[PDB]
Nucleic acid binder design. Structure first.
Length: 59
DNA sequence: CATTCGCTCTGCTCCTTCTCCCATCCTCTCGATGGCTATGAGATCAACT
């Protein structure tokens, strides 16, 4: 469907307004949800009220 | 004979360990699980006479 015009999409029975951005697995439309993670390669200093370390710096 | 010394016996902290628990009811969709071929010997007793 890449670069097709609205007329070409309609000829393929696709919807011009459909954004894409999903997969088809066994006929089911599957979307991937973005996962938050802590950023890499950055020094963070943290502390906790009830552990054997005063401060910890993690990378 | 008045210590004194040494030895046994509590019992008071401070871990480590480990076990337990985390609102009620209701609806829907979706993925997965989902298990030889065949020829022989040979024991049983259901069942004929």
């Amino acid at each position: 469907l890449n670069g097709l015009t609205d007329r070409d999409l309609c000829e393929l029975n696709e919807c011009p307004l459909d954004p894409g951005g999903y997969f088809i697995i066994n006929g089911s439309e599957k979307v991937l949800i973005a996962q938050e993670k802590m950023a890499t390669n950055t020094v963070y200093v943290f502390a906790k009220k009830d552990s054997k370390y005063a401060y910890t710096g993690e990378c």
